[PDB]
Ligand binder design. Structure first.
Ligand SMILES: *CCC(=O)N[C@@H]1CN(c2nc(Nc3cn(C)nc3OC)c3ncn(C(C)C)c3n2)C[C@H]1F
Length: 280
């Protein structure tokens, strides 16, 4: 995987898919010059650094090549930065499980858990701390295949950095590990905490964590030992994996490699681990 530099004439925006503080995502078509091939893509236009700095960040970004992480295919630099990326036709996994909650079985849910863990393990191997893992930031290529993406919070650790020490940026409190809330510290193991919350979202078909509770009260609730409740469909074996992800000692938590193994085992006999009516 290498970085392509695109001219505006190469791609076109078809429609908005969503937006936020990061910018706007469009469904689009990319036609590389003279290649006569039309590629469906997602165009992320961000809301300045030197062009060479931006291209260097895009270079490392384009080298991320894994079945469960969304890839950067090209970049266009004009008055705005436009990142051309793989299109995930079914949108964010959060909305998907909410829409299809009545028709999703244990096999799909556990497979998604495996896939997200595989993508995160790949990021860890690349020394990337994601810092924003949540069901809204996992996207659906097909019902059977999901991919993680990033909207700016991910950070690359230096050779001798074991943690990222954050500054004043806005934080997704309800997905964060306690040490991140209290001390602005982020590691692969705080990503594991967020993975646990993401799995809880999936198993509750996209329910809201700490629903109706002010973000400002979350650290105190966590310090008292309280955690998100066991989802109705979860056998205790699955819930205990979540609970391990939310242990106060980051080194107590499973690593993504461990999570791949455990969820893969469960995925072999899915109805033994998630209890879903009509499944199957
Ligand atoms: C629940 C989170 C959410 O809605 N986030 C929006 C959507 N988004 C995004 N969407 C798609 N594809 C998509 C979404 N919908 C409704 N239809 C489609 O495609 C037909 C993406 N494909 C790729 N990416 C990123 C890698 C850029 C997508 N991002 C992010 C946010 F705007």
């Amino acid at each position: 995987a290498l970085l392509r530099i695109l001219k505006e004439t190469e791609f076109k925006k078809i429609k908005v898919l969503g937006s936020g503080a990061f910018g706007t995502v469009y469904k689009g078509l990319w036609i590389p010059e003279g290649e006569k091939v039309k590629i469906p893509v997602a165009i992320k236009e961000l809301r300045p650094k030197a062009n060479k700095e931006i291209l260097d960040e895009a270079y490392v970004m384009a080298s991320v090549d894994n079945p469960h992480v969304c890839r950067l295919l090209g970049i266009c630099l004009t008055s705005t930065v436009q990142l051309i990326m793989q299109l995930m036709p079914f949108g964010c996994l959060l909305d998907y499980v909410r829409e299809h909650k009545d028709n999703i079985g244990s096999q799909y849910l556990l497979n998604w858990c495996v896939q997200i863990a595989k993508g995160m393990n790949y990021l860890e191997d690349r020394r990337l701390v994601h810092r924003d893992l949540a069901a809204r930031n996992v996207l659906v290529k097909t019902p059977q295949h999901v991919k993680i993406t990033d909207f700016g919070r991910a950070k690359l650790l230096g050779a001798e950095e074991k943690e990222y020490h954050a500054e004043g940026g806005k934080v997704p409190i309800k997905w964060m590990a306690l040490e991140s809330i209290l001390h602005r510290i982020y590691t692969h193991q705080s990503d594991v905490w967020s993975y646990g919350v993401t799995v809880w979202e999936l198993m509750t078909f996209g329910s809201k964590p700490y629903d109706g509770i002010p973000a400002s009260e979350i650290s105190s609730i966590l310090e008292k030992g309280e955690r998100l409740p066991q989802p109705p469909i979860c056998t205790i074996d699955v819930y205990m994996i979540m609970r391990k992800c939310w242990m106060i000692d980051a080194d107590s938590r499973p690593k993504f490699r461990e999570l791949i193994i455990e969820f893969s085992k469960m995925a072999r006999d899915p109805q033994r681990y998630l209890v879903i009516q009509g499944d199957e």
